[PDB]
Amino acid sequence: EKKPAVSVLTMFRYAGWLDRLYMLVGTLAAIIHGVALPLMMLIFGDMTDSFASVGNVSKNSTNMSEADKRAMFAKLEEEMTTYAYYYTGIGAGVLIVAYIQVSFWCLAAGRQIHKIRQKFFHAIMNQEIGWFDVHDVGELNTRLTDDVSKINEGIGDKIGMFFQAMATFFGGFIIGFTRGWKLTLVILAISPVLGLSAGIWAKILSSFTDKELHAYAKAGAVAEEVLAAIRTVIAFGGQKKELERYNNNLEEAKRLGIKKAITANISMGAAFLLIYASYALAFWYGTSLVISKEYSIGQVLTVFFSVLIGAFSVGQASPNIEAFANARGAAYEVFKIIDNKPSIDSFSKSGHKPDNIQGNLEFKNIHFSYPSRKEVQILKGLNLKVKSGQTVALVGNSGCGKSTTVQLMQRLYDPLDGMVSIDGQDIRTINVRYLREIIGVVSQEPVLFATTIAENIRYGREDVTMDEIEKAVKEANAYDFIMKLPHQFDTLVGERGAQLSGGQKQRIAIARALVRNPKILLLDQATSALDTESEAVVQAALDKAREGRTTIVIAHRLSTVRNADVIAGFDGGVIVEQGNHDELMREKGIYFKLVMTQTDVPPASFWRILKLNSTEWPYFVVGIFCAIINGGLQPAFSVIFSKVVGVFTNGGPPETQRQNSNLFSLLFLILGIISFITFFLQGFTFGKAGEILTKRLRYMVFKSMLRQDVSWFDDPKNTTGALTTRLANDAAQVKGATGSRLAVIFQNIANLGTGIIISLIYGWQLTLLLLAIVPIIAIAGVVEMKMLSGQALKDKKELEGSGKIATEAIENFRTVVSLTREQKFETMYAQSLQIPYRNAMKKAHVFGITFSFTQAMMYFSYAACFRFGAYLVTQQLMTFENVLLVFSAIVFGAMAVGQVSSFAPDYAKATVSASHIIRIIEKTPEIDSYSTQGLKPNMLEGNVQFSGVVFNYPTRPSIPVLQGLSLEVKKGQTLALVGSSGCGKSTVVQLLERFYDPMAGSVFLDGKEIKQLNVQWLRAQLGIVSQEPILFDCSIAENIAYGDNSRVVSYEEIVRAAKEANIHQFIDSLPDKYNTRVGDKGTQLSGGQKQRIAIARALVRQPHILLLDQATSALDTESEKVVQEALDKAREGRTCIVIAHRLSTIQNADLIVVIQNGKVKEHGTHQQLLAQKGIYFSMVSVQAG
Ligand SMILES: [Hg+2]
Ligand SMILES: [Hg+2]
Ligand SMILES: [Hg+2]
Ligand SMILES: [Hg+2]
Ligand SMILES: [Hg+2]
Ligand SMILES: [Hg+2]
Ligand SMILES: [Hg+2]
């Protein structure tokens, strides 16, 4: 894939003349900061030149014993004063400059973002309604804060950091050439091999990356299927059969993960070799040029570093480019919306605004097709008039085009052909806001906004008084119930507040329209979702609302329409018939046909996690030794680098300056080789140690997950997705807290430990300065990581309130356009952004300082060392070689632990990722399905008995469900459970399945308490038939055979089960009869046919109990009767408990139980409970209507 982007010059629109100034000044700062370090290398060379000019004089030949001390040392004391005044001068200039760099760029970005948010949100509120039809709203809402966040990255400080790095790239290669061009051109001849070597691996590391996500996608698809279907898994006890499927597809991503683990460390050691190799080749050649008195030692050390600084400056500007390019990419999708102009402008002020509107409506030859499918036409040549004050009712079948009428009259769409007119004037010639202000809509499903009732009404009109709210509420028949609410009119409604009934919400929606006082009223299926009781009060409110207004209603439920003035019957976008109720009933057309049919913070320890990888201890031993060696190469380099410069800066005969240097020069390749080996071995032992640990933990987890009982899967935290996540990536991230953490610690110890030792003996005074400053500079890098993340939470949390407003407006956009309150949410959006704006303008002031005080404390400490270290050479207390042997042992070694710790996986994220694993493993359930003990008798009777069971769902222990529920079920007969809502009938199936235990009471099977039986054997002789049957992506034969696990199951056994389920006849005509793959790829079976499979699945087990829980939850009229044939067949000679909602099934049952509030109110046969004239008699009386 390749996504488009914006031109550079476009993207920086919305940048006023002040914003254009900050970026320019911010650059000139960034340029200075970029060159600031090259000058430190240039001075560093001139520093060693002063030391080298005397380093060999005073040693070989002794002119005087103490009159020569002053001679050479008073020369250095005057030369080293300037080099020290120079070093502090940079850190002072950095402190100023580094502030300007970050401050001015983040400021110019902030002023632009604030304009973008408002310009982008207003752009969305201005779009057409056909525009919302095509686009996915979910991405759009995230696009308001994700793409906007993506632009903010690539126009803030990240540009300042780019011009800083490029000012070093040119600033570095400049001083290299101008102080000595031969040695640089050597290095620039090998660096293409390094830029080549780096890119080739990133192509192979991205190769072994994307090969991995599609490798676990096979396993993770099994994880997502099971943990969503866990109720069927536990019910049929396939908790070991799903483990093998998940495991057999789990070794692929292990062997593949090693090919990354090897290659990932080759790419390091290969590129790390080429550093040490390019080190020798530049030092071997750089030393040959000082022997001949062409260069000094200062010239080599400047040019060699200043190239590597300027060369490594590329890699420091790579992500800052990608952020700027990602910012252009995200800015394209945004700026498209701002510059997109609609034909139906809800903000324009063009058309007329006619007063004293009578409401004469007309439709003239309307042809319309929704923008999703132009090819199909909904309306074709539709003509219709509506006289002022009259009510017209539109009726028809499906695909008729009724709801289009409401949507064309608000002008949410423009008709292709024809003309919609109000009072003889075309609708397209009047102003849109005034049009929708003179119209009130009453949609099918009523919407309420997360505010008070008063604000919900004030969205009808912002300037309404509280007296007018009371009147409009009274007219809507909503007053008396509002006064019964706790906080009267200030009661908080919406998603956030108390839930109101459906009939109550729609009456509020009326009051919004009534406040507008419209001349036209539109009702789009206003009472479809409401029941018979709530509809009656609303119709009185609507009939009141219609008085003196022209009205068009999209009417279902035809009885409400009989008193209407005129009816219109639709067939294929055309009105076929029109007249009064009596006329169309007489016509015996379309309308007559319709009327007559009606009438997360756990604490895991480091030692616990490490024990998980204990079964591969030999891999850990090698990685420790190997980690020590690579940790030893860093202080080794400090010697070999110092021993080189020690030759030409302490004194020696030119007879030995060749073999010493060439030795030390080729000792870098020795370090370079050993680097390549230790990386090739670090990722071969700790690498496999991590990829084994992933596979073994994903198995242990998914094993332990299925062990858990149902109350665990009932939790809100343990959702099927959050468990697949926990099983997918969290299971693998543990390895960053086992062997990787030992590779770190042994490398950090072997480096900084042995580096501390050496520097202490070679110079005990200077180290106490540096090892006192290293803690200071390391802390500063941490506090920036803190305040960068602690501020990331603060700003991103202040923005959700702004985002809640937007989310409320996008998710209900069709509403707000009808209320014409686009401007309101715009202001509400802007008012919410006033807080993060004024906060972010001081954020740049902060991060300007924290960036300056980090860089300045480094350059000042660079001067505090080479000032104090110079004082140690003047007093003859240490050699300049020992300075570099101290400095490049502590500093370059203290930098090494960061380059290590920053390369390894996130240890904090790894430990918490591991603590979640251990809980999921070490958790044993109240009901161990994997257990083996239990009575498990040879008694095949089937006497069920509940005795006073008391149960509360542990997810909600406050509510009760069952209180003293007792009931028996004799062998072979049927028991039916019925009741109102929240009675507890479905709990019986789950307690006999033993998904949960009861708090008190007991459940017996064949006179034996089920808590003593084996759980698998209990569920074995129970045949569950769930409401919505879960079918797995597999063939018919395997899905049915899943019922009875651990059986040979041959061809002969399969067909008998499908026969008795009444699918054999339907199957035999299907393509490839019983081998037909079922799932998303294969044939889609109807809801009734799926249930017969779940019945067939239960029949193969041959259980002596059958639980039927709300089966037949569908309207498949033909397939319905087929299911009941199969259901009656299964119950004939088995103990049966039925969760009854259909009144036809229960009449022939042997016994019935009416439950209410966990108590049996009455029980008996059908005829007895009918003659009881109690609760059960009330239920049968309802169907007589
Ligand atoms: Hg910033
Ligand atoms: Hg319709
Ligand atoms: Hg290693
Ligand atoms: Hg130093
Ligand atoms: Hg119920
Ligand atoms: Hg399957
Ligand atoms: Hg039965």
Side-chain angles (χ1 to χ4, degrees):
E1 187 178 2
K2 289 168 184 176
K3 299 178 180 181
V6 187
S7 55
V8 54
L9 182 54
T10 296
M11 187 192 177
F12 287 86
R13 68 179 187 169
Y14 310 121
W17 64 274
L18 203 80
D19 301 337
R20 299 187 196 277
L21 187 73
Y22 289 128
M23 296 186 289
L24 262 58
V25 181
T27 299
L28 264 63
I31 302 300
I32 297 166
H33 195 184
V35 303
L37 188 66
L39 310 196
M40 295 294 291
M41 299 295 98
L42 223 181
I43 300 153
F44 178 78
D46 294 6
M47 187 185 71
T48 74
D49 291 334
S50 65
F51 284 106
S53 71
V54 339
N56 61 347
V57 173
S58 301
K59 314 295 187 167
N60 294 86
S61 295
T62 310
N63 282 29
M64 293 292 279
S65 61
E66 298 174 348
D68 185 34
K69 279 174 179 178
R70 66 184 81 187
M72 306 304 302
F73 295 169
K75 186 190 177 178
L76 293 181
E77 189 67 14
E78 297 171 5
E79 293 184 11
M80 295 301 305
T81 302
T82 308
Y83 297 143
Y85 266 29
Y86 269 7
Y87 285 162
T88 48
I90 312 303
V94 142
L95 188 151
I96 291 165
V97 152
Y99 179 82
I100 304 297
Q101 175 182 347
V102 175
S103 62
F104 282 27
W105 268 104
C106 183
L107 218 76
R111 290 161 63 91
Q112 287 184 251
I113 295 295
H114 193 64
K115 292 192 182 178
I116 290 163
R117 289 186 190 284
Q118 305 185 6
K119 296 278 182 172
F120 184 27
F121 182 78
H122 165 79
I124 300 170
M125 299 307 305
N126 198 5
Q127 295 297 326
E128 275 183 23
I129 316 307
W131 191 91
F132 272 76
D133 287 11
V134 309
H135 286 95
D136 181 28
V137 305
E139 65 184 352
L140 180 65
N141 194 42
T142 60
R143 192 118 68 184
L144 184 66
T145 63
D146 280 12
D147 287 34
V148 171
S149 285
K150 268 191 254 185
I151 181 166
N152 201 341
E153 302 298 342
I155 63 169
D157 54 42
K158 297 200 184 321
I159 311 304
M161 307 312 183
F162 172 78
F163 287 134
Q164 176 172 333
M166 294 300 298
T168 307
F169 171 82
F170 295 114
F173 290 170
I174 277 168
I175 60 166
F177 277 65
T178 60
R179 265 287 187 273
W181 60 265
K182 286 184 183 180
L183 176 55
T184 63
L185 199 71
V186 167
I187 302 167
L188 306 179
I190 191 165
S191 59
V193 188
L194 275 67
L196 188 80
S197 177
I200 57 171
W201 290 119
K203 296 167 189 175
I204 301 171
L205 298 185
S206 289
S207 172
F208 290 110
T209 296
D210 299 88
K211 289 171 183 179
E212 195 174 20
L213 304 198
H214 287 2
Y216 177 78
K218 206 177 186 180
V222 183
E224 205 281 336
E225 190 185 38
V226 170
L227 307 182
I230 188 75
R231 307 300 181 98
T232 310
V233 176
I234 295 177
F236 294 104
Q239 293 154 294
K240 290 277 183 173
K241 202 178 186 182
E242 299 293 347
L243 181 63
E244 286 192 350
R245 298 209 314 179
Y246 180 76
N247 188 78
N248 286 332
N249 302 16
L250 205 65
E251 188 170 357
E252 275 190 4
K254 173 177 162 289
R255 297 281 184 169
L256 209 158
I258 292 166
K259 261 60 181 175
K260 183 181 171 183
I262 285 170
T263 305
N265 290 261
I266 298 294
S267 309
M268 294 287 283
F272 233 117
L273 170 76
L274 267 57
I275 303 299
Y276 285 103
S278 63
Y279 242 91
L281 178 132
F283 259 47
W284 170 89
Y285 180 87
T287 231
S288 70
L289 302 200
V290 65
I291 284 173
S292 54
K293 271 69 170 187
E294 301 180 37
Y295 287 66
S296 167
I297 192 72
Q299 297 209 303
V300 56
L301 293 195
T302 293
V303 305
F304 175 75
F305 292 170
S306 299
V307 167
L308 288 187
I309 306 310
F312 282 16
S313 293
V314 153
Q316 195 171 4
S318 169
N320 291 327
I321 285 169
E322 202 173 354
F324 175 78
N326 293 340
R328 283 181 314 179
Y332 175 83
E333 297 294 346
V334 173
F335 284 15
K336 188 190 293 280
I337 314 316
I338 301 174
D339 300 317
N340 192 338
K341 297 156 283 186
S343 71
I344 301 169
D345 199 326
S346 43
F347 283 80
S348 178
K349 312 187 181 297
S350 53
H352 300 66
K353 301 172 73 177
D355 295 288
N356 295 35
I357 314 105
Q358 305 301 124
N360 281 3
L361 310 173
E362 185 170 26
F363 281 57
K364 250 174 179 168
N365 192 39
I366 303 297
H367 299 248
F368 177 78
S369 305
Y370 284 106
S372 170
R373 300 178 182 88
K374 67 173 192 177
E375 215 78 59
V376 66
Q377 292 106 339
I378 309 299
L379 271 57
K380 283 171 260 59
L382 171 59
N383 294 273
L384 173 63
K385 313 182 187 177
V386 195
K387 301 190 284 207
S388 163
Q390 205 172 54
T391 299
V392 56
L394 312 187
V395 218
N397 303 343
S398 290
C400 32
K402 302 175 293 243
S403 301
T404 307
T405 302
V406 170
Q407 294 174 341
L408 295 181
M409 178 60 68
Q410 305 182 69
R411 205 191 171 193
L412 309 174
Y413 311 90
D414 267 318
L416 179 268
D417 214 331
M419 187 198 305
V420 175
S421 173
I422 297 171
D423 290 17
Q425 172 167 210
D426 194 351
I427 193 167
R428 308 194 306 277
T429 59
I430 57 170
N431 182 58
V432 182
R433 191 181 294 193
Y434 194 87
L435 161 58
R436 294 164 181 166
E437 278 176 351
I438 65 170
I439 299 176
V441 72
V442 186
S443 303
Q444 189 183 156
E445 189 173 5
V447 61
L448 294 183
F449 295 94
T451 339
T452 61
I453 308 302
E455 295 294 321
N456 248 275
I457 303 301
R458 240 190 298 276
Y459 289 3
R461 177 154 54 84
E462 301 181 33
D463 59 78
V464 176
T465 62
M466 194 65 68
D467 273 28
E468 292 175 2
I469 295 171
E470 268 190 54
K471 288 206 168 169
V473 166
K474 287 169 186 177
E475 291 174 4
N477 296 338
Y479 183 71
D480 61 341
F481 91 89
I482 286 171
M483 304 303 289
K484 291 176 71 176
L485 276 166
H487 321 277
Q488 297 174 119
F489 275 93
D490 286 271
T491 306
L492 206 71
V493 88
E495 179 69 6
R496 304 290 172 185
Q499 293 176 333
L500 305 184
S501 67
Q504 287 174 345
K505 296 170 72 187
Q506 195 70 258
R507 281 186 288 175
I508 290 168
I510 291 167
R512 283 190 307 206
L514 288 173
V515 118
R516 305 170 88 76
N517 189 16
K519 306 295 183 180
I520 301 160
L521 193 69
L522 269 39
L523 294 81
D524 182 19
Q525 294 201 55
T527 356
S528 179
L530 299 177
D531 68 289
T532 46
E533 197 174 5
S534 291
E535 82 183 348
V537 63
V538 178
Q539 197 67 23
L542 300 173
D543 287 349
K544 284 172 182 177
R546 288 192 299 93
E547 193 172 358
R549 299 182 168 96
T550 309
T551 309
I552 309 183
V553 52
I554 311 313
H556 288 207
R557 303 162 95 76
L558 300 93
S559 302
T560 61
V561 135
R562 180 170 182 167
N563 300 22
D565 308 36
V566 56
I567 312 302
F570 280 56
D571 193 350
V574 188
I575 293 171
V576 191
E577 50 187 65
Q578 180 166 315
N580 192 266
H581 169 275
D582 294 317
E583 274 114 54
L584 283 85
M585 292 288 285
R586 170 160 57 181
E587 193 94 42
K588 293 182 75 176
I590 301 168
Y591 177 74
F592 176 78
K593 291 182 180 61
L594 278 80
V595 175
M596 294 291 287
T597 51
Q598 279 193 354
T599 285
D600 312 327
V601 282
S605 179
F606 174 57
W607 308 122
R608 183 70 188 81
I609 299 169
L610 235 173
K611 197 160 182 170
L612 306 181
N613 219 332
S614 62
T615 50
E616 285 75 28
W617 81 86
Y619 293 79
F620 274 59
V621 180
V622 181
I624 286 167
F625 296 159
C626 176
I628 293 160
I629 297 171
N630 203 279
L633 306 186
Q634 193 69 36
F637 163 79
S638 303
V639 177
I640 307 312
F641 167 79
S642 169
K643 293 283 181 186
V644 158
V645 182
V647 167
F648 305 83
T649 65
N650 284 21
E655 307 183 41
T656 60
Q657 294 186 338
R658 185 70 181 244
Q659 207 275 358
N660 269 327
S661 63
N662 281 22
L663 167 55
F664 302 138
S665 193
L666 302 198
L667 283 179
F668 292 156
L669 261 85
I670 302 298
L671 263 56
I673 292 293
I674 302 161
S675 178
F676 185 88
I677 309 306
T678 53
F679 272 109
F680 163 63
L681 301 176
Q682 183 169 312
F684 207 95
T685 60
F686 282 143
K688 286 182 177 178
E691 304 303 323
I692 292 168
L693 186 69
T694 302
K695 184 261 184 67
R696 181 153 49 75
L697 266 52
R698 288 178 176 176
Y699 174 82
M700 283 186 182
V701 165
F702 194 71
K703 168 157 181 174
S704 180
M705 280 179 171
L706 307 180
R707 191 174 173 182
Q708 302 301 319
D709 58 337
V710 174
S711 59
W712 190 73
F713 294 90
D714 288 12
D715 198 275
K717 299 183 182 179
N718 312 332
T719 47
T720 183
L723 294 176
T724 305
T725 302
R726 188 59 52 75
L727 180 59
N729 56 12
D730 274 288
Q733 289 176 9
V734 61
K735 63 195 164 49
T738 60
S740 299
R741 191 65 180 168
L742 299 177
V744 166
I745 297 165
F746 279 100
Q747 176 153 19
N748 295 352
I749 286 173
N751 165 41
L752 200 78
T754 60
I756 280 287
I757 283 165
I758 288 172
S759 64
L760 283 163
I761 60 167
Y762 270 70
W764 165 63
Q765 287 74 335
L766 178 58
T767 62
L768 182 53
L769 188 90
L770 302 194
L771 77 93
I773 293 170
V774 160
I776 298 169
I777 311 304
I779 279 168
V782 149
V783 176
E784 208 179 355
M785 282 176 63
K786 179 188 103 68
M787 293 184 163
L788 187 140
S789 179
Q791 187 67 56
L793 299 177
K794 286 183 289 187
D795 284 324
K796 297 169 196 180
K797 207 180 286 175
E798 296 167 3
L799 215 73
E800 76 175 310
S802 313
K804 282 204 294 290
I805 296 169
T807 304
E808 195 173 30
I810 311 315
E811 290 186 338
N812 306 278
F813 185 73
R814 272 179 160 278
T815 291
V816 62
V817 68
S818 304
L819 293 127
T820 81
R821 295 286 151 280
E822 306 97 335
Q823 177 54 220
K824 178 63 172 183
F825 286 98
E826 251 192 66
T827 303
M828 291 178 71
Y829 194 66
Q831 288 177 357
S832 72
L833 294 172
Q834 295 180 348
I835 272 163
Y837 183 73
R838 300 194 290 262
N839 277 20
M841 302 300 270
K842 197 184 178 186
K843 182 190 173 177
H845 185 101
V846 166
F847 292 171
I849 298 163
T850 66
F851 183 70
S852 291
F853 199 72
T854 51
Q855 296 313 262
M857 273 298 303
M858 215 172 292
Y859 280 35
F860 292 150
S861 72
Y862 213 95
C865 166
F866 287 113
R867 178 63 179 174
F868 180 78
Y871 183 84
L872 302 181
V873 185
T874 56
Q875 239 68 353
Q876 302 179 333
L877 193 64
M878 78 188 294
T879 77
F880 178 79
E881 183 189 329
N882 299 343
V883 163
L884 299 175
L885 208 143
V886 166
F887 169 83
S888 70
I890 276 171
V891 180
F892 294 0
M895 291 172 176
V897 312
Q899 186 172 353
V900 167
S901 298
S902 299
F903 151 75
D906 189 5
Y907 178 60
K909 192 184 183 71
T911 43
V912 306
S913 175
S915 73
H916 287 162
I917 295 297
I918 295 155
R919 297 168 68 268
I920 298 184
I921 294 177
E922 292 185 352
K923 187 167 187 147
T924 47
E926 292 271 345
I927 301 171
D928 190 293
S929 307
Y930 286 168
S931 181
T932 187
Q933 283 77 359
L935 304 189
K936 181 150 58 180
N938 313 321
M939 305 179 186
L940 297 76
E941 291 287 2
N943 189 353
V944 182
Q945 174 174 336
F946 277 50
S947 179
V949 316
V950 183
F951 175 69
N952 298 341
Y953 279 109
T955 311
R956 306 196 70 181
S958 57
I959 297 170
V961 52
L962 293 190
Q963 297 154 117
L965 187 83
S966 303
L967 47 88
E968 287 183 352
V969 201
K970 304 176 81 174
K971 182 178 172 60
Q973 74 178 193
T974 293
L975 186 91
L977 308 183
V978 295
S980 63
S981 299
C983 53
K985 57 174 82 171
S986 289
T987 308
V988 173
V989 171
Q990 297 178 337
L991 293 179
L992 193 59
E993 283 280 0
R994 220 190 158 191
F995 297 154
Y996 318 87
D997 274 319
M999 304 200 314
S1002 290
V1003 178
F1004 296 97
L1005 171 56
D1006 291 325
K1008 295 176 178 179
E1009 193 179 3
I1010 60 169
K1011 296 176 70 170
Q1012 198 81 14
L1013 296 172
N1014 184 261
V1015 191
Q1016 292 292 347
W1017 181 86
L1018 172 58
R1019 298 166 179 159
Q1021 283 90 15
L1022 300 180
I1024 187 167
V1025 181
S1026 294
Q1027 178 183 37
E1028 293 181 359
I1030 293 93
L1031 300 180
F1032 294 95
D1033 290 336
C1034 223
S1035 63
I1036 289 289
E1038 301 299 330
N1039 248 274
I1040 297 172
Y1042 185 64
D1044 193 336
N1045 298 323
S1046 68
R1047 180 145 159 83
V1048 68
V1049 193
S1050 299
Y1051 302 92
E1052 298 175 345
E1053 201 175 11
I1054 299 163
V1055 70
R1056 179 169 60 100
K1059 284 172 177 159
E1060 298 178 23
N1062 296 117
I1063 28 165
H1064 171 84
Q1065 299 295 336
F1066 176 75
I1067 287 163
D1068 271 83
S1069 76
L1070 288 177
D1072 299 327
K1073 296 174 182 173
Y1074 278 83
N1075 295 335
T1076 310
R1077 198 176 186 281
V1078 180
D1080 304 340
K1081 295 180 177 179
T1083 183
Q1084 294 178 342
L1085 305 186
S1086 62
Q1089 295 170 356
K1090 295 169 71 183
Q1091 189 67 283
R1092 286 138 61 186
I1093 297 168
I1095 293 171
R1097 177 169 57 186
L1099 278 185
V1100 199
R1101 306 176 95 187
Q1102 294 289 328
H1104 302 69
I1105 297 170
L1106 188 68
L1107 305 93
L1108 307 176
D1109 194 345
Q1110 293 191 33
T1112 82
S1113 278
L1115 192 50
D1116 311 21
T1117 51
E1118 192 81 343
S1119 289
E1120 269 288 347
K1121 292 180 178 178
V1122 181
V1123 175
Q1124 290 291 352
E1125 285 178 349
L1127 283 167
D1128 295 332
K1129 196 183 288 178
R1131 288 200 307 275
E1132 63 183 348
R1134 299 185 160 92
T1135 311
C1136 315
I1137 304 177
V1138 189
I1139 313 308
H1141 287 71
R1142 299 180 67 169
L1143 310 177
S1144 59
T1145 38
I1146 200 166
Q1147 287 199 349
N1148 302 285
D1150 299 32
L1151 181 60
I1152 295 94
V1153 169
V1154 186
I1155 311 175
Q1156 66 179 351
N1157 302 125
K1159 296 270 173 51
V1160 178
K1161 182 62 177 294
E1162 58 185 22
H1163 67 266
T1165 56
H1166 159 71
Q1167 302 295 345
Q1168 186 173 347
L1169 291 175
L1170 190 76
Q1172 178 65 9
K1173 296 179 177 180
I1175 305 298
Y1176 179 78
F1177 175 80
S1178 300
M1179 287 178 65
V1180 66
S1181 66
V1182 175
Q1183 69 173 6

